[PDB]
Amino acid sequence: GNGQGRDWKMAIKRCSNVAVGVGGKSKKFGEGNFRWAIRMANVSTGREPGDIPETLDQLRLVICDLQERREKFGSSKEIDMAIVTLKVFAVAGLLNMTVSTAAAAENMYSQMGLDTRPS
């Protein structure tokens, strides 16, 4: 629960290069995107609104719970945006791995087996 730390800002800064669209013909991820995605995920999964994931493991738990909810209740433009936004924050932010688009981050998140729930 700390979206004010300097490590948090560096994570967002890394994700500033990532595009929401599949090409160079789109927007760039902003800090508002991630705060919205995290908050929307916390409320949906019985977490406190302002709970900020510190480690990668914490974020994966949120993503797993959110994807599970999408599997049970259904998909939508909002919940898909939230899930992919967290995955971008996971790959390009915490792991610091260069991805061009959100689709690339989504693809890297799966290949590295991050979809699997930790223990």
Author numbering: 2 to 120
Original paper wording:
Matrix protein (MA), p15 in FIV or EIAV and p17 in HIV or SIV, is the N-terminal subunit of the retroviral Gag polyprotein. During the viral replication cycle, the FIV p15 matrix protein oligomerizes to form a closed matrix that underlies the lipidic envelope of the virion. In FIV, HIV or SIV, the N-terminal domain of Gag undergoes a co-translational covalent modification of the MA N-terminus with a myristoyl group. This myristoylation, together with a highly basic patch of amino acid residues located at the N-terminus of the MA, directs the Gag polyprotein to the plasma membrane (PM), mediating the association between Gag and the inner leaflet of the PM lipid bilayer, where Gag forms a hexagonal network. The structure consists of five α-helices (numbered h1 to h5 following the HIV convention), which give rise to the close packing of adjacent helices typical for retroviral matrix proteins.
To investigate which interface could be the biological dimer that we observe in vitro, we constructed a shortened form of FIV p15, p15-Δ120, which is truncated after Ser120 to remove the residues involved in interface 1. The p15-Δ120 truncated protein was stable and was still able to generate dimers in solution in MES buffer, even at a lower protein concentration (3 mg/ml). Crystals of p15-Δ120 could be grown, and data could be collected to 2.6 Å resolution. The crystal space group for p15-Δ120 is different (P21) from the full-length protein (P21212), and 2 monomers are present in the asymmetric unit. The truncation of the last 14 residues does not alter the overall conformation of the protein, as demonstrated by the RMSD of 0.5 Å between the Cα pairs in the truncated protein and the full-length protein. The assembly in the asymmetric unit of p15-Δ120 resembled the interface 2 observed with the full-length protein. As expected, interface 1 is no longer present in the crystal packing of p15-Δ120 as the C-terminal residues involved in this interface with the full-length protein were truncated. However, Trp37, which was involved in the hydrophobic interaction with Pro131 in interface 1, is not free in the p15-Δ120 crystal. Instead, this conserved residue demonstrates hydrophobic interactions with a PEG fragment from the crystallization solution in both monomers of the asymmetric unit. Finally, the interface 3 observed in the full-length protein is maintained in the crystal packing of p15-Δ120 with a similar buried surface and intermolecular interactions as the full-length protein.
